[PDB]
Amino acid sequence: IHHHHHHMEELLDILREFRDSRGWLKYHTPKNLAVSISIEVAELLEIFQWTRSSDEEFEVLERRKGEVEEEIADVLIYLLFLCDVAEINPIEAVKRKMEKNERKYPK
Amino acid sequence: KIHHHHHHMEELLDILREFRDSRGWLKYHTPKNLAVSISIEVAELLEIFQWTRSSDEEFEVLERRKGEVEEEIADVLIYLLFLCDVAEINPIEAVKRKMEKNERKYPK
Amino acid sequence: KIHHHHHHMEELLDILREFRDSRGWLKYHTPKNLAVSISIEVAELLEIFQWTRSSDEEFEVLERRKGEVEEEIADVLIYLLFLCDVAEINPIEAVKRKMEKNERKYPK
Amino acid sequence: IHHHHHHMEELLDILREFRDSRGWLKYHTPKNLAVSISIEVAELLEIFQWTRSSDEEFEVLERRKGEVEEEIADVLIYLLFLCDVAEINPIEAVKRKMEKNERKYPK
Ligand SMILES: [Cl-]
Ligand SMILES: [Cl-]
Ligand SMILES: [Mg+2]
Ligand SMILES: [Mg+2]
Ligand SMILES: [Mg+2]
Ligand SMILES: [Mg+2]
Ligand code: NA
Ligand code: NA
Question: What stretch or stretches form a coiled coil here (chains A, D) (predicted)?
């Protein structure tokens, strides 16, 4: 018995249900979703706004772990909504870019 | 009768980890630097649609420049997953938790 | 017969400098921290228009939420001017120089 | 003889001439300009992408002064184009926010 865990695919089903039960697909234009990603990554950055050292950055991370988790989740949700409307497979996207990176930055 | 689970996500992170550590780039992967790198890449994504003036037009641009859109999506996710690693955050769990919160804030 | 020049921009920066130094916040104003603060504020500005679906609609939102738009513009410019101070960059000169370059790249 | 230097007002005239000689006003929707600001501040941030200390940040600034200057200019140009279309006075905006800041963060 073989179980193929495709976690982003599974996440997308939870996402689609939410969006569609509310009728918010009509707002998910490519640029509105890209703008939504921009907004959430700014929320992530704000948590570390005024740190002055790599050392302090890890201290803020530990103390505000929950906030970091939420903004990472936010960035992801919108990236996945974007992948839905654009018909892009984000895992394959990552694999192809990493392959490109391997031949840009060789060992 | 034996169950065989395949962890495709852990497999993807392994490709990421291997790239990172073969190049000695871990030392650069502080929490803020990674968050800065995500911000940079989403702006690369935004740029593709910079001057569009209608929803209709964004889909024409998306169809026409799909490859560039795919690259920038990959760049965003790469650095997001790198951050997840340094922070020991499970981004699948984080999404599920956030959607559960979203359910309560925006009820049916 | 005497000429009396008024440096309104230098006056504005003085208000900024005075706020900063009365609070002992200079030590926080590193180049990257300021650039991070600008990124944060432009995203506050973007948020006002997050779900608009037409140019027509953006002007209705801009008219309706003009005060919020004004605040975020102020926030962006504040941190941009703080960066100019630490970097000793004259942003009026930088614009003029960049527009001169823009002239040559995009000729009439 | 009194000279009232209003430098952003003066910049805006150079900006308007450029935009209008090319017929690009039609692209300057509020959200396109906000998105353009987002793009340029990312260009600014990239210059410092991988620094690991406040010390290194000032070293990068000195070495890549020109690049920083250009991206600051870029951020400004779009903020001023935005102020044009929104009919906002950015100097007065700054003064009012600073006044608000003074009574939020008292001495
Ligand atoms: Cl997995
Ligand atoms: Cl002046
Ligand atoms: Mg959020
Ligand atoms: Mg990229
Ligand atoms: Mg603000
Ligand atoms: Mg630029
Ligand atoms: Na460490
Ligand atoms: Na210093």
Answer: none
A-contacting chains (≥3 CB pairs under 8 Å): B, C, D
Interface contact flag, D39 B50, Cβ < 8 Å? yes
Residue C4: DSSP 8-state: E
Q: How far is CA A23 from CA A20, A73, A78, C90, in A?
A: 5, 21, 16, 49
CA atoms within 13 A on the CB side of B53: 9
DSSP letter string, B2-54: --EEEEHHHHHHHHHHHHHHHHT-GGG--HHHHHHHHHHHHHHHHHHTTT--B
Q: How far apart are CA C33 and CA D58, in angstroms?
A: 11
The residue to which tokens 């890209």 are assigned:
A34
Give the closest ligand to the alpha carbon of residue B72.
Answer: 4
**Chains with 3 or more CB pairs under 8 A to chain C:** A, B, D
Q: Tell me if D13 is assigned to a ligand binding site.
A: no
* Nearest CB to C40; choose among A26, A27, A42: A42
Closest residue in B to D35 (Cα–Cα): B50
Q: Which ranges constitute the DSSP H helices of A1-107? A: 7-21, 30-47, 54-63, 65-86, 90-104
Q: Taking the mean position of all CA atoms in its chain, how far away is CA C42?
A: 10
- Tokens (6 digits) for A31: 């640029």
CA distance C47 to C50: 5
Tell me the residue range of the domain where A4 lies: 1-107
Test mutation, B28, B34, B36, B41, chain D, max D CBs within 10 A: B36
Q: What angle do CA C91, C94, C96 make, to 5 degrees?
A: 110
Q: How many residues does chain D have?
A: 107
User: At D106, is the secondary structure helix, strand, or coil?
Assistant: coil
Ligand whose nearest atom lies closest to the CA of D38: 6
